[PDB]
């Protein structure tokens, strides 16, 4: 046990940094004059481009398979000083990791070498989706009994038939609403999607990740593919994941990214328990800027006193609150990825921390922005402060990578209840 | 003790939601499709113009002193109710009641006669404004041996000279930044403004306020009174509240509300008691419109699952949270008009009630609002739901009408520490 | 609406707490030099018997049913009152209380006047208990599919066999083990008290409540009724509340309550609605004690420094969350025992009421208790202070008279999930 | 970064757990017949004795220093073990390992030596103390113009003369109230101790600390050294803490520790942020008992359900509440002690960390045994569960070891207002 960082840690810090300071901070100026979602997501290309261009895409890629990702810590302290000065593109990076996530995962190296390629190039603006989410929601979507996924596949031939609404995937439609680069659309397989799912077949080995490209998206009819809308957000303003209707789409049967079932959903679960680890570095990140804009405000600011604000009890005891939230969070999301790294322990082990770490990280972030809004008081809620951009940013966390209320701590849930868990493995072994 | 409404009551609530269905909802339709602060507010004066003519500014004023107000927990129903729709206008409407509160609260009948008799006429769009809070802060502006305020006043022959600044005070510009139609400045008297408050005077016994009106602005030049500035606010996006400077502002003697000193330090702290209570109103509305949103949610909607969303034991745990805090809060806010309302008691005991409830039902609200998101789950993130409109929103009340970590916390704890305090004496009697 | 005492509401008040100080103070004397819970409560019954002749066994029964009980708004000033000072046969009264409830509320004259005589004659000690809680649990003891109460009751001629076990009914044994001296025992109805309950008849239809005094269980063999044990608790050390066995236990069919089912149920739940919104009177007390212990020492010890501890804003933060929490909750209490006597109101709301009393009382209790411990320090963990005590008694409060997490919660779920729930018609009617 | 155990920290583990089930597990059968709280301590004298042969005393002593301590994270993980099953003699372990700190930490070998040599043993049962605690508390010690330790000392030829009162420090009596083998007795100089402290001079510069054993005690007069009394504690009731007077008794020049003034101030600053740090490790124990009892009766219980209570989200909820808790705060106790042995880090940044570490697993630790117990339900509040013991057990360590409001969280803010304070040093570096 040793909490030391290596040079290409510190390095990776520096380099982020470096980034989110040179390149990230102009990016505002672009979008903020922008209309609606899109054009503000659009206006944020350039900016993405140089991410390209610093080499920040390649870095989403294990080693192995042409990246230059060095860990799950690197890929930590990197989001934390992104987010921590701009979620603008940073958020792009992210989107796109998770959707490479199945493929990085997969059985398959020629899948692997086919799809990875533009990402792993250093040109280009590519975008990367795990379209998972649906108008009609996700948090049951493997209940036995249940309605299941809504968006279907059928197989006709040599091809995968997609019907079905997709909503909230990050980055699904491209910049252009042609489609992006690479994305995993995850289904249900129905022969007849007039039919109810069968009550009476395990949800989860009906799952297919059929992946779907500009390329395939194109070979299809102008409205087999058609964007209904785009979410207008509390914060994160420049992201997009629209509304994505799939009506008759015609997808190949080598884009099928691994057998049907178990082995489909397995996938998709490792992929959404990583970056459920990863997200609490985001949130990290964010209430940092909370925290940190406080605390410089709380030691040069006396409001109208005789000392600065950091010196009345009330106000240091809000700033030691978020404080102890942010380290007990880097900590743990820290444990949970080098967790998620470790070749010795189960998978539900591995599971269980991912979960806590998403839970905690993004519920405690929410508590920071706003103890350092109260503790700045009044000035916090007029936009010459970060703090309104950074409130409506941090309520994101708890909801999405899946909320806490309807499926993280359901999954956490089901492992305690398992005869076998055991709860110290992570730490303690066995 | 008796909860049962009398009709009066019951008819001044289905009189306030007739007025915010009718009126106020059609107030965004307007107001959304401005570019500032200013032009949001301006946009909103046809719906302030209605409710004069609803009787509501009118209601904002004791029977005995000419108005429609028939007590303050009829106050606390209607303000909950308009808050529950629209806090535009809404706010306005409250911000014109604390304005008119030290002339409602003097002893003198001329000056109430003179100065109330715009807000009750039952015509125009009159505004009234309380100039208290300062840009450098006013959490220390009775701190002994502090600066103390900084917009001062100075007697010079037959009337007074305002020197200074004004941040955050509701409508203070009016409609077109020329003023509102009554203004209570506060300001320290000094007669040579460049120099420090005296470390050795009481701060309470220097505390002036002068009633400034459109055309005591009017009857100067026009660099004596400057907007400098609209902040751009998180929530509560049609408000004003700007930031002014007096320079070498002339007032007549005829306009000082009362002799300079103690006198006039309570009866400003006794309108911002009053309103401390009445705010709680405001939050209940509020968090109600979340936690009633997520309740038809909850009802109405599996999530993709077997069952409504309400059957899950997580669910209905943050619904009930929500609904303890709305129902505790709104005893609370009854409790405290009805002690503020009570000639019997000491003012200590009314001062210490009122600030119990600002702190208690402003926090909660905030709580309430979250975990209404939470249950609702990623929907309650996009801007057709009224969860991101009432996020923001509802991060006003713990920093507005006095903070609570810098004055409320600060204006209870010195009650608290009396040898005299009795903590039971509203509910117990002395 | 109104919060002002009645002369008789203030006198109930002056009563408790002269009867508190004069007698309950003398308790402890007494039974802390006992070895084993039934000895403490043993040593007990002089203090009960002042109760008795005090006339506050009586003011347990309504002055329709020839007791002195006011009104609630009097019963809870009255718990608050002993509670403040002394548990000990302060809880025996309210278990008393709740014992006799059923036969208060069941609508038979001959019943009420036959076994609420002792309990109205202002002499002995005579005791009552309501015979719910079990080994197993109770928590779903209306579950449609399980196993449903473990006491069952069936129809032999022109009697009923009770065949089962009870534990934590409070006073269920009597003084002596020979019973209390009115028991109401809930059952369940199975003709073969072997057979699992069937899982298609609706539980709430099983429900029988037989009334056994000393008499019933003197008619009885000596091993048809056997206390298997006294549990030793955390706090409340004074109190008994077996461990019961009933095999073959003899009960005359004029013992029977009411009409097995429905009307049955209904009738325990209708008392433990009650119960539950006055328990909140008993949190108050206790968590009361605990603030104005830390509220004395706050202003009286410089903890060796320079000025009483409550002018260190931490301090005063803890001081002014414990005064919120015991504000709101007595206000709380008081709108729902007012509530359950509006015979106006239809059930649902009452109950509903009721259940957010308890969870919200009984849990922000707690955290009042332990909140006025970390602003005392040290010292408050040393039982020359009554902190030691109150800890321990505190925590009896989310968890006993049905626990906060699998009961309260539950039954107020189910009403707001009801299709025709109003959630402020308590405050607003419909 | 690297979370991965090592054999010997391993071992460690396995050892303490060993102990802990073969040793500690009698204890209660020996000290529960017991009738006060050195009686009880006094049972324990045999538990001492076995883990001094267990090599737990000696372990105490760092390496180099003749004793067998490999690091703090096996310290922590050891203390965890021990905590997880009983606190008897566990807590008089930590005790003599706090009073050894500043001999441990000074820079003098032949001192070290000296009085070391029994600890390092392997013999007996010998106890040290850390005296700093006074019956007017210590919060304030430090403050410049306050009152001061009222444990004075005077030169007077080649000898000191301690005059005053200690409370609390733990062993500090002996087995027999003739004192601990080695207590370290804090006191302030001054030459006249009816004198009160000069409000010129910087407290921390008139700080002593003299070396007192059972040899020093039997040099004096019968009434120089006097045990006045022996707190009863709410939990941990086999530990000694007396209160003790001190009168004109005389320590030998040689027994000054180091030279009085910052060295010796700064001594006991830095074995008490050691302590906060691994104080964490005790607060985890207790609470994981807490959580471990709970979940296994989650998984065991369907408390007459049809499923085991686990399976209850409200359940679940608080279990996956608990666990998050416990492993952050692990996490933070390995952060902090590694951080401690940082030698490139400054003081104030290992200082900031072991503050942070304490506020939060002592304050969190509480909510977790808490939260066990309303999972658990009514059963949790009856002396065969252990939560009776451990909810008394877990609320010494926010109040003990330097509180949290008083001492802990006001030297973290006094670090936090520092001009170069930065928040990362622990985790990026300067
Ligand atoms: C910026 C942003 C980026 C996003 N990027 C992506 C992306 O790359 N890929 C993608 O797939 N999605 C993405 N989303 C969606 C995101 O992951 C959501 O978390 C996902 O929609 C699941 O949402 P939900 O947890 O609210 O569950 P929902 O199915 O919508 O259920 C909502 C609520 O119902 C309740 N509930 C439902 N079922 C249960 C139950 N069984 N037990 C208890 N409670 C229950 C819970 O309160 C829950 O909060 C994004 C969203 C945003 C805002
Ligand atoms: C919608 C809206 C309407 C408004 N309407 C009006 C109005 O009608 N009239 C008017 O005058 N103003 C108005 N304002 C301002 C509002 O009343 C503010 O609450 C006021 O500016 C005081 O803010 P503050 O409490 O943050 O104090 P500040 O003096 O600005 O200090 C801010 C922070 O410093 C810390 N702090 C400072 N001093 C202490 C201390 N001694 N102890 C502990 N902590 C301390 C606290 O954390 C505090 O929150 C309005 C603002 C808004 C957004
Ligand atoms: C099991 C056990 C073992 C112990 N072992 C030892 C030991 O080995 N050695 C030893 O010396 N002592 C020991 N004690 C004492 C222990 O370390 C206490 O923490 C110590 O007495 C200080 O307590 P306190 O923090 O409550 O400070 P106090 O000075 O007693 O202050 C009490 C309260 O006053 C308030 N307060 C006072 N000043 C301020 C301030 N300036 N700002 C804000 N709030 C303030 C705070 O709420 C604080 O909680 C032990 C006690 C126990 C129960
Ligand atoms: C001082 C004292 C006096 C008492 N007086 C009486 C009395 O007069 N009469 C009487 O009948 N009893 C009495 N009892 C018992 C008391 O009312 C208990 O509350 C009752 O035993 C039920 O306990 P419980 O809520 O924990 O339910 P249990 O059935 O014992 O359940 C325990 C825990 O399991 C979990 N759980 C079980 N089912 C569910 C579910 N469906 N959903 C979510 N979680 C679930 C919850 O976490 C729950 O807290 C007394 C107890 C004490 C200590």
Sequence with gaps: VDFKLSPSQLEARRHAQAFANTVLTKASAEYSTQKDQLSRFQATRPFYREAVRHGLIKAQVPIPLGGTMESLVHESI???ELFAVEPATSITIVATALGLMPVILCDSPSLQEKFLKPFISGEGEPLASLMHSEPNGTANWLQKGGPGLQTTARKVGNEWVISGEKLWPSNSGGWDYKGADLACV?????????????????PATQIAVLLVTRETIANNKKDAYQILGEPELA???????????????????????????????????????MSAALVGAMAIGTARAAFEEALVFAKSDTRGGSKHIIEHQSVADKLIDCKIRLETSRLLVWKAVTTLEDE??????????????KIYTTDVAVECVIDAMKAVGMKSYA????????????????????????????????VMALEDYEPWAATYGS
Excluded at 240 to 265: D, I, M, Y
Excluded at 344 to 357: G, Y
Excluded at 388 to 402: A, H, I, K, T
């Design 344 to 357: 010795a322990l189960e998978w539900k082990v591995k599971l269980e921390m991912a979960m806590q770490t």
């Design 235 to 273: 914060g994160h303003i420049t992201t997009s994941g629209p509304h994505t209707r799939f009506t008759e789409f015609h997808v190949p049967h080598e884009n099928l990214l691994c057998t049907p079932g178990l082995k489909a959903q397995g996938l998709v679960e490792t992929a959404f328990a």
């Design 383 to 414: 936009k010459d402060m970060s703090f309104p951009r950074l409130l409506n940013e941090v309520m994101c966390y708890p909801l999405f990578e899946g909320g806490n209320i309807g499926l993280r701590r359901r999954q956490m849930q089901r």
């Design 78 to 80: 990197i989001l934390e």
């Design 186 to 202: 995850v289904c249900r397989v129905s022969d007849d999607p007039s039919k109810p799912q069968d009550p009476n077949v395990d």
